[PDB]
Amino acid sequence: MIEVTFTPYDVLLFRESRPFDAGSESVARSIIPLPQTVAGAIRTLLKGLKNCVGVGEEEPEFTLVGIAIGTEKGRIYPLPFNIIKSFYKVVNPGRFLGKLILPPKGKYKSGYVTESILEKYLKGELKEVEENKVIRIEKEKRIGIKLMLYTVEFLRIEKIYAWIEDPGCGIKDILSSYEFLTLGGESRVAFVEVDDKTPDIFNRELGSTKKALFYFSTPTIGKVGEIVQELEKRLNAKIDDYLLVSSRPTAISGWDMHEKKPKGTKFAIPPGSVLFVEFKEEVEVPPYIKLGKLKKLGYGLALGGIWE
């Protein structure tokens, strides 16, 4: 599994022919050239890579295991939906009428958490999180022009991590030959770094238990019952009960490049949701597992956890 690290930058298209320089002078703008720089678009590599991206096919040959964002503090993740605000408290499943339920203890207040904290959470060692440990990401404001003015907002991010499973497309070699790549459908370019190793978060060892949990780190497409079904068959274990702690479905669209049309809308369990499972017999919880539809496009990344 390779780890690709993107460092995004917005592109400013400047002209050598401008009216008033007093403007850019007051802002102290400096335009320094970047010699020997290798740029390129993902709309061009997708350069021989045609042999791994089906023409008119929805998914590629390789699998995008998942994507995570990072700030100056490193990689961060949506605060697990069962962590309620008061200090933030971790609330585990209770029971009633033989059914797993989430005891009422307050409203969930969204935010992010560092991999460090999520790691303690997945091991069931986290009881609460000091509010200064919970991250809030500032929204970036841009004026969008499609190619009518638009309002474009997105999270203030420093890094984007992509985990890729390459069956033999030579992706590591292609990417390694580039320093910069312009993203898809945006005037953004990014620096590219490629590491030939799999991340710690995926090599964890949770041991074996009957009370397991699965944190959805990327949107996971599928009806609850189906996901719980896929989980049983994948782990060859029976699930006597489960509880999905989530908010509401998020609409996933996508562009069908073959049809020159938008893809059919799909609904997904949003990142941050936690699936609490109670197996019949002990299971050795995997560090991570892919569930639902469009796995190869990055959806369905679930991180294994434990609860008591």
Binding site: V91, N92, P93, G94, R95, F96, L97, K99, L100, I101, L102, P103, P104, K105, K109, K141, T151, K223, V224, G225, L243, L244, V245, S246, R248, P249, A251, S253, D256, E259, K260, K261, P262, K263, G264, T265, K266, F267, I269
Partner: protein, 618 residues
Amino acid sequence: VKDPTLLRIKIVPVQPFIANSRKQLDLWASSHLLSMLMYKALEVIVDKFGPEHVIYPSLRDQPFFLKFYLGENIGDEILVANLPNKALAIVSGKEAEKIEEEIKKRIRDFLLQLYREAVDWAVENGVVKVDRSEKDSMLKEAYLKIVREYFTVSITWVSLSEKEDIYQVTENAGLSDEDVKKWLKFAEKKENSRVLERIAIYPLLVKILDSLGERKVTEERFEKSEQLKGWKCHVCGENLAIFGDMYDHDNLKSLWLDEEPLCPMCLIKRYYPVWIRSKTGQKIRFESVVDVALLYKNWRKIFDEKYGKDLVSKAREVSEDFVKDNMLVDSDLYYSSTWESGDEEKVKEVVDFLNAAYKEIGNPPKYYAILVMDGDDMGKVISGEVLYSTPQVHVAISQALANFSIREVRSVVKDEGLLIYAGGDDVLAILPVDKALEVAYKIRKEFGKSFELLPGWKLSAGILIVHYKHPLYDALEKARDLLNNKAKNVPGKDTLAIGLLKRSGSYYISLVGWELIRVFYNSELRKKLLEEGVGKRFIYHVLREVDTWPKVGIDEMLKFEVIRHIRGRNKEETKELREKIYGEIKDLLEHVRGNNEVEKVRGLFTFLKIITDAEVFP
């Protein structure tokens, strides 16, 4: 009721559906339709057991109930959405499962019914310029499926008569504390036993049923199916637009009025207003946010009384499409700028005419306010009060809430703006900026009278002021955010979060206690700012003095600044005025939220910066 069973109804989604709106009319339609769905669900329970068996909301005086069940002749009050998306009722155990399936069906059929009626209405009115056969494709499964699956009506129930070890039931449900174990003790006292009937711990049962109910709602709302590929709705951009799978973007747009393709849900939304009109002969007084904005200082009335006639004349002149019923089609034609971008020389008359009017009457209000109010800690405060007698006190609480929402909230809003929703302790209203503060204050005050220095029943609120051109979706998001993340985030809640979002993108937020509104309104400071740009620099200088702690201290800095900017007509007046303004600033500081004096001064002066903005309060 044979075997008493507590039943809970939950309908989602709410805010996401309301936010998917382009005009005020859509906004009102989403909210009203939501209340309509709950009503359809409750009538299923009333038919079998009557209203007295519906604990919450209180049907007794619900307009919807009086007009659609007991068939009365209620008026425009029917326009308000008074039913929340959640309800609790006592029914018969053997009937519960039927009732569940029965509620899902009446809601499903009602929506399909509105959809087909909407398709007919749409084609017969130019909404969608389509073929004769193509009209039948609008009713195919793909579109029907979207209507059938958009809303989730979830029902869960529990027997009130079954016996259980009280301690173990609450412990296992993760509800056991000291305060709860203590209550459970007094319970085991009354009935010399610890194994009681579920209704014995009713207060804790409501909380547990809520959790059991929430488990089910998330399980059902995710049982959705995929949609056909194609261009999406222009209003929500989420669901496939009708004919979105048959045409390219350009040809799809040409088939729709205003070139805005709609999806099944947003079509129902556009039709809902006429449906209600045909059903009750009623329609909202203000249809656009612009209509609510022009209520500022009676500009709309004034202008209409001294320029209303001519404008329509010169309008009709430029074109006959801008006029109708001797009045403009859209209220935005009241803005010069609308003509310049939305027979040239024939238009130059309109522009010059309007600009001229603005000279004598003043520029037209372009900002309006969105008010959202919501009870603080209602869940705990209610169960606390309730802590077979309990259910009765719960009904009493609910009736007190329905009474407040139906009669009292309605009374302070009158026709000063548009009251869209009022479901008990919660409110959604669109108001002109010069009424927002007072309206919110009165609603908070009335709420306090209906439920009585350290009050137990409180309301927090968000008031967002925006330009009439601001996307409604974003405005609702920001109003909710002011309520949930700003006001409700203040320890002790009971706060009003005021946000001013200028067209330029600048965003000013002030967190205040309710009394700031009273104290400010009656202040000499308020009168002096209105007759001054002295106010602007005074506010600029104070704020600059509190980007950090001022060396000389807050009091000394405030006295100094007051002296530098406040003056009367003679030493006599100016001295008393400086002493009065200084003391009012200190009284106001008492009501601004903040972790310290620097933060309080900043919040107060940010608030002042907001209500003295000439663009918003011309």
